[PDB]
């Protein structure tokens, strides 16, 4: 996992490709293409440039680049802010809490119930089938956090 | 993981949560505690709580289970929000591209040389670092995708 700081790097890094994301974008895949020419052969619309003259002229490969860059900083910063709020969690109840992840469990168990209870009619088999499996991830994510931080059980 | 349609049951069931989040707090820990004594030993500030009545009665009590389902909402959001970016990337380019994680390894590489070209002073070492941790966390995010999925990147 990253630290706290290692994340704010890598959105503020971010924040520069933005910036210019149309070079950016332009020179990663060139970067790519010509480092490792068997990648162009998945890309029906560039494997034709030989050149890096043609791939920087190419509209094409500059719009996919752009693209590109763009997925790829939605994915990091929506995981940057999943991991804001998870880890916080884990650094307090591993080290100071010291909560094992049997008791997470326990209490998963508890909100089932507690929503099963309450709400009969929204919490059915397949809610309660997709709750169950949210608390667990919730749990595995929590559960490596622990182990980076030196609390196994 | 989860399904969209399966993170949006759970959502929608969490939007229930918030309308009386007090309610549901105290009914959680009082079900955890009552269940799992041993849970309760890890709550040196509740260790006055002896019985079901005492519990109901707690300010303190009260507050935490408002406390930790506030938390755990936020954890949920966050978590459903990164998903829902990496799977469809990681779908097409399973099912549709076929790409393999050596070439997300490609570049990864060269969007790590191009940020270093064009930031020179800004990336050093540190946030190159952490650029790296976060593209390789990304490469095992598709490649658990890619296994659920029956693709062998
Ligand atoms: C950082 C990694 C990557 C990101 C964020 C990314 C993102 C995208 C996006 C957003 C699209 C358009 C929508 C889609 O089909 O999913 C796309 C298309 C595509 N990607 Fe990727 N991709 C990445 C890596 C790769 C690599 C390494 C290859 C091949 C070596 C590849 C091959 C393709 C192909 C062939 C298409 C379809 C292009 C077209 O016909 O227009 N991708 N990619
Ligand atoms: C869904 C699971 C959980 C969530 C979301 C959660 C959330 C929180 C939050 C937000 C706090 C306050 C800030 C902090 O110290 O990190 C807290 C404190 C604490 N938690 Fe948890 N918690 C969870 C599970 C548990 C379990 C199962 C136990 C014990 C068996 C536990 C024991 C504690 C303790 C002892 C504190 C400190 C209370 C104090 O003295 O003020 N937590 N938790």
């Given amino acids: ?27 990663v895949l060139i970067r ?5 020419p068997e990648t162009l052969e998945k890309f029906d619309k560039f494997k034709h440039l030989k050149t890096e003259a043609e791939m920087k002229a190419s509209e094409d490969l500059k719009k996919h680049g752009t ?42 168990d508890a909100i089932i119930h507690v929503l099963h209870s309450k709400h009969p009619g929204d919490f059915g088999a397949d809610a309660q089938g997709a709750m169950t499996k949210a608390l667990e991830l919730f749990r595995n994510d929590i559960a490596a956090k622990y182990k980076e931080l030196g609390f196994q059980g």
């Avoid at 996992?1 to 490709?17: I, P, R």
């Fill in 1 to 27: 996992g990253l630290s706290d700081g290692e994340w704010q790097q890598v959105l503020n890094v971010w924040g520069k490709v933005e910036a210019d994301i149309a070079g950016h974008g332009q020179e």
């Fill in 32 to 36: 790519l293409f010509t480092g490792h």
């Fill in 67 to 108: 693209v590109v860059l763009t997925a790829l900083g939605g994915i990091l910063k929506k995981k940057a802010a999943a991991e804001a709020e998870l880890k916080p969690l884990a650094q307090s109840h591993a080290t100071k809490h010291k909560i094992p992840i049997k008791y997470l469990e326990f209490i998963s």
